[PDB]
């Protein structure tokens, strides 16, 4: 034998890299050389997922301060956590007193969203985080459209919220 010589449809972790490198170079030529994305993968899978897990905490990571089509995948899964940041930024207060009460009532949901990460993913695939935090990030995102990040206080907030 020698074999029937596996097609590009079959082999997919070395010819996959070859095709990825080739279409990347083709696009870079078709623009001119002002695009510049090396590495069909890199860093790893788990490292990027842990990076995004830290994005949902709403703080710094290794790729943000808070193929080449990874960025399109990465934007919606980072933008879940950049929405978590805008509710903790709406919160410090324990004038207006009922505004302090409403702001402290937000934190009882923020701690749930912070607890769901680092309990349900102990690093899964990145597409899993994209699917899982759509049914979870949406509920948080409605409240970020709600909150100012000024904001009403007194009878104006007590009547707007009713």
């Amino acid at each position: 034998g020698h074999r029937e010589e596996p097609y590009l449809t079959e082999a997919g972790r070395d010819a996959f890299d070859k095709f990825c490198r080739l279409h990347q170079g083709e696009l870079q030529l078709l623009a001119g050389g002002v695009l510049q994305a090396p590495q069909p993968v890199l860093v790893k899978e788990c490292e990027l997922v842990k990076d995004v897990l830290n994005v949902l905490i709403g703080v710094v990571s290794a790729t943000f301060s808070l193929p080449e089509s990874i960025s399109s995948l990465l934007s919606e899964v980072a933008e879940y956590g950049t929405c978590y940041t805008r509710l903790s930024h709406f919160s410090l207060q324990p004038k207006g007193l009922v505004f302090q009460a409403f702001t402290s009532g937000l934190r009882r949901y923020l701690q749930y969203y912070r607890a769901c990460v680092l309990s349900t993913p102990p690093t899964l695939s990145l597409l899993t985080i994209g699917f899982l935090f759509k049914k979870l990030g949406r509920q948080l995102r409605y409240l970020a459209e709600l909150c100012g990040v000024a904001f009403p206080t007194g009878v104006k907030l007590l009547s707007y919220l009713y």
């Binding site: 207060q93 324990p94 007193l97 302090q100 009460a101 402290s104 680092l118």
Partner: protein
């Protein structure tokens, strides 16, 4: 994650300095009992930190678990540290800082996390009065 666990050290140094410096008779009878009911909370923080070490020795402790464990004890020490700074700085002593604790019970009351600490501290400080 190290940066968000670090305020409890700053709000432990203040409480332990207030207990040694304010136990003499130039600050008066009320400040003794006030620091005396602060002293049990210092012992309580130490009791927490020892159990976490006993857990850390088997490689079982993480920084995330450390954050979750110290979140109940962060609030208590924060109220104690801010109050101790204010009482030493303005040199308030006697019953003028037994009015201040009655006010501090009111000052943050919207979630009433701080009222229940300060009511306890007032009762203890007003026991010799």
């Amino acid at each position: 994650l190290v940066h968000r666990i670090l305020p409890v050290a700053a709000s432990y140094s203040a409480v332990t300095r207030f207990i040694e410096e304010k136990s003499s008779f130039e600050y008066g009878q009320v400040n003794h009992a006030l620091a005396a009911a602060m002293r049990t909370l210092v012992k309580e923080h130490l009791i927490l930190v020892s159990q976490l070490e006993q857990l850390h020795r088997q490689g079982l402790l993480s920084l995330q678990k450390l954050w979750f464990y110290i979140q109940p004890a962060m609030r208590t020490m924060d109220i104690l540290a801010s109050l101790a700074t204010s009482v030493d700085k303005g040199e308030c002593l006697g019953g003028s800082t037994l009015s201040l604790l009655h006010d501090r019970s009111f000052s943050y009351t919207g979630d009433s996390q701080a009222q229940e600490l300060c009511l306890y501290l007032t009762k203890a400080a007003s026991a010799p009065y």
